[PDB]
Amino acid sequence: AYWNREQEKLNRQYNPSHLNYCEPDLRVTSVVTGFNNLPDRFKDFLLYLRCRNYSLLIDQPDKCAKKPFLLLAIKSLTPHFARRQAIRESWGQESNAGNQTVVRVFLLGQTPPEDNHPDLSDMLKFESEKHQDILMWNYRDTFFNLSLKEVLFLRWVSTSCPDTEFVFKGDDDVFVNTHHILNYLNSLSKTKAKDLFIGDVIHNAGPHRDKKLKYYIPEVVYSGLYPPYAGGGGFLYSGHLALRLYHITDQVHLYPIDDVYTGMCLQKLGLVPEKHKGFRTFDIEEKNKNNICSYVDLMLVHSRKPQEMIDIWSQLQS
Amino acid sequence: EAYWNREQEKLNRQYNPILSISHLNYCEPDLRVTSVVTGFNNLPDRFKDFLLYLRCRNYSLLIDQPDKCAKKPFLLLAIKSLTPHFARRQAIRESWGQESNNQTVVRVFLLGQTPPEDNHPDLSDMLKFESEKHQDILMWNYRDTFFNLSLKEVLFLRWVSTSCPDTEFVFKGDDDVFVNTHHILNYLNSLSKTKAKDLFIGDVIHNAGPHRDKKLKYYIPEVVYSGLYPPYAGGGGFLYSGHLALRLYHITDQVHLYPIDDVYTGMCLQKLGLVPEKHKGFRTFDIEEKNKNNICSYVDLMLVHSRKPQEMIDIWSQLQSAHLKC
Ligand SMILES: *[C@@H]1O[C@H](CO)[C@@H](O[C@@H]2O[C@H](CO)[C@@H](O[C@@H]3O[C@H](CO[C@H]4O[C@H](CO)[C@@H](O)[C@H](O)[C@@H]4O)[C@@H](O)[C@H](O)[C@@H]3O)[C@H](O)[C@H]2NC(C)=O)[C@H](O)[C@H]1NC(C)=O
Numbered sequence A: 001a002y003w004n005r006e007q008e009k010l011n012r013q014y015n016p017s018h019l020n021y022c023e024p025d026l027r028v029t030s031v032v033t034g035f036n037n038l039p040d041r042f043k044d045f046l047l048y049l050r051c052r053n054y055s056l057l058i059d060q061p062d063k064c065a066k067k068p069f070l071l072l073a074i075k076s077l078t079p080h081f082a083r084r085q086a087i088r089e090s091w092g093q094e095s096n097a098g099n100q101t102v103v104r105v106f107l108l109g110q111t112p113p114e115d116n117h118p119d120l121s122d123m124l125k126f127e128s129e130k131h132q133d134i135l136m137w138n139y140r141d142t143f144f145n146l147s148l149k150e151v152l153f154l155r156w157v158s159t160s161c162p163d164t165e166f167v168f169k170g171d172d173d174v175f176v177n178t179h180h181i182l183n184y185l186n187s188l189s190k191t192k193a194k195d196l197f198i199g200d201v202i203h204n205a206g207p208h209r210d211k212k213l214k215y216y217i218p219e220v221v222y223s224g225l226y227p228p229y230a231g232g233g234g235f236l237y238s239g240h241l242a243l244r245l246y247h248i249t250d251q252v253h254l255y256p257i258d259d260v261y262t263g264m265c266l267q268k269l270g271l272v273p274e275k276h277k278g279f280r281t282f283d284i285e286e287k288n289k290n291n292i293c294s295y296v297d298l299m300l301v302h303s304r305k306p307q308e309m310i311d312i313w314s315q316l317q318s
Numbered sequence B: 001e002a003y004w005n006r007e008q009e010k011l012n013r014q015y016n017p018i019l020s021i022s023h024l025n026y027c028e029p030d031l032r033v034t035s036v037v038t039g040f041n042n043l044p045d046r047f048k049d050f051l052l053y054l055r056c057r058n059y060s061l062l063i064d065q066p067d068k069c070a071k072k073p074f075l076l077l078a079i080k081s082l083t084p085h086f087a088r089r090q091a092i093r094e095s096w097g098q099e100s101n102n103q104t105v106v107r108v109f110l111l112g113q114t115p116p117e118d119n120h121p122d123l124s125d126m127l128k129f130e131s132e133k134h135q136d137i138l139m140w141n142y143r144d145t146f147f148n149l150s151l152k153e154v155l156f157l158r159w160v161s162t163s164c165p166d167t168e169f170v171f172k173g174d175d176d177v178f179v180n181t182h183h184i185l186n187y188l189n190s191l192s193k194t195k196a197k198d199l200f201i202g203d204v205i206h207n208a209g210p211h212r213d214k215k216l217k218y219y220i221p222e223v224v225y226s227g228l229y230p231p232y233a234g235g236g237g238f239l240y241s242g243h244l245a246l247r248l249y250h251i252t253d254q255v256h257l258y259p260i261d262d263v264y265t266g267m268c269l270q271k272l273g274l275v276p277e278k279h280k281g282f283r284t285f286d287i288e289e290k291n292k293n294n295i296c297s298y299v300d301l302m303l304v305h306s307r308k309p310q311e312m313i314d315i316w317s318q319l320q321s322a323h324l325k326c
């Protein structure tokens, strides 16, 4: 498998370019058997795997001027204006209660015209100027570039928010019980809090070989099993681990699934993420969707629409 | 026995002397319906809201484009949309919904309110910025819901009569369909004066009935509506003359609002003595699968349902040279 072989090469190089080679890696079309018959997203991933020095087009350099207790980092796409606004008004509110600063950033790439995306750049600039919470990098925002979104976000944390006590990274289609998370973080002993990483962790998972699935991975790309990883909509970790995570990203090749890439970085650090039952990545039962007390005892639910996020958050306040 | 049918019968008696509280601007709750409609308390909330406020339709225009038709348009594009649908509207602006010219084509998006009381995110400042930039937003001060779409129809027809009465033709459609606007212009220019005067074409269905399955999107209880629907064009868009648009609005006062907007339009057409015409170019159920990847499939149709914003821009881009390939 290509990724396995290339990761083995990377280990040798770091125990005596893959970071700023941004020309097409034309060799992959010869080393990967059946390359021409692969879907375009795999072609783009393999051809441009070795480039990750993308620039920040929209920054919020003063987002963490005061040391945050919790940084909310939400992955989003340019046209998702309603999702971002509902998060701003509901569980993603910035706050300062009890000297525990909560700050919010949305993580965006480019939706370029070459991919037939509508030009929403002026709307995005208006949103950025109004809400001061948009981080946007100059790369093609795609599913297979989400591990790139992860690395560039971790880079931003190291340069612009290195002192945040904890980090929540999640999707813009989940409801998050931020009160439950804050109570959980404040209940942690210093021992568990230093290297906290929790979520919906699955062990001994493998790459999907069914070509019809969303997260299909060919045998020529990756072989073997996945490391333990938290996926399904969000995970929570300490700022200390965020710095260790970013430092190790150079030593791990990007992977088409961002949550698997994060698990690889944790495994290279010698850490095992812990499953927490409050991460309901497969939603809750049907009858309980409109029972607010079913949201009291969990961290997040996947998935909810913008209107539902505001409605649940409103009822949650009482 | 059905509520809408009985109330429409009362309305017919008022407007037709041969058959021998306002229904247009009473905007308090019609508290009588909770006793006259059997099982009212067990109806879904959208039916309760529909029945309680049926007699109100004098809603105000919050965002207007009063000079949209300062030059006599040949074709007015009116697209139904919701506040958060920024990507759909922008893709339409860049592709098939471009305004163009001596055949003026103009574009408006038809919006209601997505109020905070209904837990909608506050996107009002974004919408105002969008309106100031593109000048194609029409927004009325009513609750924008599926069962209020016939209100969107009535209020749009009112705007045509007051602000765009001289447009030669009107296309009303959804913000999730691709429209071959070139094909529509060629079709309109091929019309005789006789056929063009009362043009109304689309995906017309005859002898359709209300869905009684409580789980379906367009479910209608037996206590609300009985019998069959009139012939009506639905499924994503229809095309008609501006002369007929004025006749359509004039008759709206004589027809009670209905929870399905396209059925309401068919009711108005039937009251005028007109029958909408089926046109094969309205592909409301999409095209075949392999044909989706052939731009030649799009050169000889009016619209396709449905397409995403990127797909709209991609198809429109390939259509500009389809005359060389097809
Ligand atoms: C289509 O759009 C219509 C216009 O937006 C919608 O009509 C609105 O419907 C809402 C309910 O969804 C009504 O709001 C309710 O009003 C009643 C009565 O409030 C009045 O009386 C109370 C005291 O009893 C007083 O405090 C208020 O100031 C009012 O004078 C309340 O009891 C409810 O709690 C709720 O506020 C709107 O009044 C009504 N607006 C108008 C202009 O008619 C309609 O619902 C939409 N239809 C569909 C199918 O979605």
Ligand SMILES: *[C@@H]1O[C@H](CO)[C@@H](O[C@@H]2O[C@H](CO)[C@@H](O[C@@H]3O[C@H](CO)[C@@H](O)[C@H](O)[C@@H]3O)[C@H](O)[C@H]2NC(C)=O)[C@H](O)[C@H]1NC(C)=O
Binding pocket: A022, A023, A024, A041, A042, A044, A045, A048, A051, A138, A139, A140, A141, A142, A144, A145
């Ligand atoms: C992840 O994001 C990166 C950066 O946006 C993407 O790399 C870019 O990929 C496009 C193709 O999708 C490249 O454009 C192409 O360049 C070749 C050069 O021969 C040309 O033949 C094509 O017509 C097209 O212009 C672009 O150069 C490249 N940018 C950089 C800086 O490398 C990448 O595709 C994204 N990956 C995934 C899996 O989506």
Ligand SMILES: O=c1ccn([C@@H]2O[C@H](COP(=O)(O)OP(=O)(O)O)[C@@H](O)[C@H]2O)c(=O)[nH]1
Binding pocket: A074, A075, A076, A077, A080, A141, A142, A143, A146, A170, A171, A172, A173, A214, A232
């Ligand atoms: O190209 C993309 C696709 C998705 N996302 C974000 O990734 C998260 C999860 O996406 P999705 O719900 O489609 O994936 P799934 O739940 O099926 O794993 C959402 O916040 C999206 O906005 C993104 O940032 N870029």
Ligand SMILES: O=c1ccn([C@@H]2O[C@H](COP(=O)(O)OP(=O)(O)O)[C@@H](O)[C@H]2O)c(=O)[nH]1
Binding pocket: B079, B080, B081, B082, B085, B110, B144, B145, B146, B149, B173, B174, B175, B176, B217
């Ligand atoms: O409350 C609403 C709901 C829908 N729409 C518009 O109605 C059109 C068709 O709606 P949809 O595709 O969701 O329904 P369909 O009849 O295709 O199942 C679209 O342009 C929507 O933006 C609207 O204007 N207000």
Ligand SMILES: *[C@@H]1O[C@H](CO)[C@@H](O)[C@H](O)[C@H]1NC(C)=O
Binding pocket: A020, A021, A022, A051, A053, A054, A055
């Ligand atoms: C990254 O580095 C390479 C050279 O190492 C350079 O050519 C490229 O422009 C840089 N930036 C981007 C956006 O790739």
Ligand SMILES: *[C@@H]1O[C@H](CO)[C@@H](O)[C@H](O)[C@H]1NC(C)=O
Binding pocket: B025, B026, B027, B058, B059, B060
């Ligand atoms: C409609 O008209 C009635 C009486 O003229 C008025 O009471 C009502 O408020 C109006 N509805 C509006 C402006 O929404």
Ligand SMILES: [Mg+2]
Binding pocket: A171, A173, A302, A303
């Ligand atoms: Mg999701």
Ligand SMILES: [Mg+2]
Binding pocket: B174, B176, B236, B305, B306
């Ligand atoms: Mg539709």
